[PDB]
Design an enzyme around this catalytic site. Structure first.
Site, mmCIF file in Angstrom:
data_model
loop_
_atom_site.group_PDB
_atom_site.id
_atom_site.type_symbol
_atom_site.label_atom_id
_atom_site.label_comp_id
_atom_site.label_asym_id
_atom_site.label_seq_id
_atom_site.Cartn_x
_atom_site.Cartn_y
_atom_site.Cartn_z
ATOM 1 N N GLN A 19 -21.017 -6.053 14.248
ATOM 2 C CA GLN A 19 -21.891 -7.193 14.109
ATOM 3 C C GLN A 19 -21.492 -8.322 13.085
ATOM 4 O O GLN A 19 -21.767 -9.340 12.907
ATOM 5 C CB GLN A 19 -23.062 -6.742 13.634
ATOM 6 N N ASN A 182 -24.303 3.151 14.373
ATOM 7 C CA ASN A 182 -24.507 2.075 13.666
ATOM 8 C C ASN A 182 -23.473 0.820 14.191
ATOM 9 O O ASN A 182 -22.770 1.076 15.285
ATOM 10 C CB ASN A 182 -24.044 1.973 12.334
HETATM 11 C C1 LIG Z 1 -30.139 -6.394 11.120
HETATM 12 C C2 LIG Z 1 -29.833 -5.449 9.568
HETATM 13 S S1 LIG Z 1 -28.431 -5.689 9.004
HETATM 14 O O1 LIG Z 1 -28.270 -7.200 8.787
HETATM 15 O O2 LIG Z 1 -27.652 -5.055 9.629
HETATM 16 C C3 LIG Z 1 -28.478 -4.985 7.679
HETATM 17 C C4 LIG Z 1 -28.087 -5.619 6.176
HETATM 18 C C5 LIG Z 1 -28.055 -5.232 5.067
HETATM 19 C C6 LIG Z 1 -29.021 -3.689 4.756
HETATM 20 C C7 LIG Z 1 -29.365 -3.469 5.925
HETATM 21 C C8 LIG Z 1 -29.364 -3.818 7.294
HETATM 22 C C9 LIG Z 1 -31.282 -7.320 10.812
HETATM 23 C C10 LIG Z 1 -31.236 -8.026 9.551
HETATM 24 C C11 LIG Z 1 -32.200 -9.558 9.394
HETATM 25 C C12 LIG Z 1 -32.275 -10.395 8.313
HETATM 26 C C13 LIG Z 1 -30.917 -10.574 7.714
HETATM 27 N N1 LIG Z 1 -32.628 -6.653 10.724
HETATM 28 C C14 LIG Z 1 -33.290 -7.010 11.889
HETATM 29 O O3 LIG Z 1 -33.264 -7.627 12.697
HETATM 30 C C15 LIG Z 1 -34.735 -6.020 11.929
HETATM 31 C C16 LIG Z 1 -34.379 -4.830 12.970
HETATM 32 C C17 LIG Z 1 -35.550 -3.594 13.027
HETATM 33 C C18 LIG Z 1 -36.835 -4.334 13.038
HETATM 34 C C19 LIG Z 1 -37.096 -5.515 12.106
HETATM 35 C C20 LIG Z 1 -35.841 -6.421 11.964
HETATM 36 C C21 LIG Z 1 -36.096 -7.607 10.858
HETATM 37 O O4 LIG Z 1 -35.829 -7.441 9.783
HETATM 38 C C22 LIG Z 1 -36.511 -8.926 11.463
HETATM 39 C C23 LIG Z 1 -36.947 -9.248 12.639
HETATM 40 C C24 LIG Z 1 -37.569 -10.420 13.171
HETATM 41 C C25 LIG Z 1 -37.286 -11.560 12.108
HETATM 42 CL CL1 LIG Z 1 -37.757 -12.971 12.412
HETATM 43 C C26 LIG Z 1 -37.037 -11.436 10.906
HETATM 44 C C27 LIG Z 1 -36.469 -9.951 10.594
#
Ligand SMILES: *[C@H](CS(=O)(=O)c1ccccc1)[C@H](CCCC)NC(=O)[C@@H]1CCCC[C@H]1C(=O)c1ccc(Cl)cc1
Length: 215
Positions: A19, A182
């Site tokens: 990613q 992952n």
């Molecule tokens: C992906 C996770 S990551 O960037 O790979 C990551 C980085 C460091 C530590 C752990 C993981 C994204 C990051 C979003 C913010 C930068 N996460 C998500 O999209 C989440 C996936 C599971 C459900 C919740 C979701 C989330 O945090 C989210 C959803 C919608 C909105 Cl508008 C904002 C956040």
């Protein structure tokens, strides 16, 4: 359910992706799930396009996050069920800025008809995965940055912040575990995979388990 399952050993899981610096985990989770479901519907294993979701799914927030369920709904409701091949819509968000959607010049690689939301119960998620294949999940991955292998037994389990893909489990091991794909390259974890302890809701893994349906 079987004592152990590993969909990678059936040839059902594509290579680990990257990613990059974009928060597009949700798209890799969803797409990885579709990739596997499409294969299990009797089709050749095909790399599909996260960039289609990251750029074109406006219900979600690209590099600022999203939900796998919204992605599945977008594919069905806004793109006629279609998912493009990665080859035809290459990932272009690795630096952290997702470009504008492009609707032209892509090739359909798979289709879906809907998605299912699975119970918040690790045994029932495992039983479903044994029959029907890999499952998209949300987890707390805040403690995963340094993971280099092994079964994670003390995962920080406080807030969902990451989307990944259950590809298997092993209930008979001394520490029973989930096998999780992952999207942080093969240089992270166990050639890009992580095992977490199963049965104690490590990393909040049971909270948001779902899968696309290929018809
Ligand atoms: C992906 C996770 S990551 O960037 O790979 C990551 C980085 C460091 C530590 C752990 C993981 C994204 C990051 C979003 C913010 C930068 N996460 C998500 O999209 C989440 C996936 C599971 C459900 C919740 C979701 C989330 O945090 C989210 C959803 C919608 C909105 Cl508008 C904002 C956040």
């Amino acid at each position: 359910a079987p004592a152990a399952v590993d969909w990678r050993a059936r040839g059902a899981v594509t290579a680990v992706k990257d990613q990059g610096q974009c928060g597009s985990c949700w798209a890799f989770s969803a797409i990885g799930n579709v990739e596997c479901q499409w294969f299990l519907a009797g089709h050749p294993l095909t790399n599909l396009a996260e960039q289609m979701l990251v750029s074109c799914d406006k219900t979600d927030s690209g590099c600022s996050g999203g939900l796998m369920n919204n992605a599945f709904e977008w594919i069905v409701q806004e793109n006629n069920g279609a998912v493009y091949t990665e080859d035809s819509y290459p990932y272009a968000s690795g630096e952290g800025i997702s470009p504008p959607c492009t609707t032209s010049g892509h090739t359909v690689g798979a289709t879906i008809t809907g998605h299912v939301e699975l119970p918040q119960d690790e045994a029932q998620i495992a039983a479903w995965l044994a029959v029907n294949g890999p499952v998209a999940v949300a987890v707390d991955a805040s403690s995963w940055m340094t993971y280099t292998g092994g079964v994670m037994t003390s995962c920080v389990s406080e807030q969902l912040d990451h989307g990944v893909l259950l590809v298997g489990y092993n209930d008979g091991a001394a520490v029973p575990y989930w096998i999780i794909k992952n999207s942080w390259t093969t240089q992270w974890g166990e050639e890009g995979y992580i095992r977490i302890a199963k049965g104690s809701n490590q990393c909040l893994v049971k909270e948001e388990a779902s899968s696309a349906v290929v018809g």
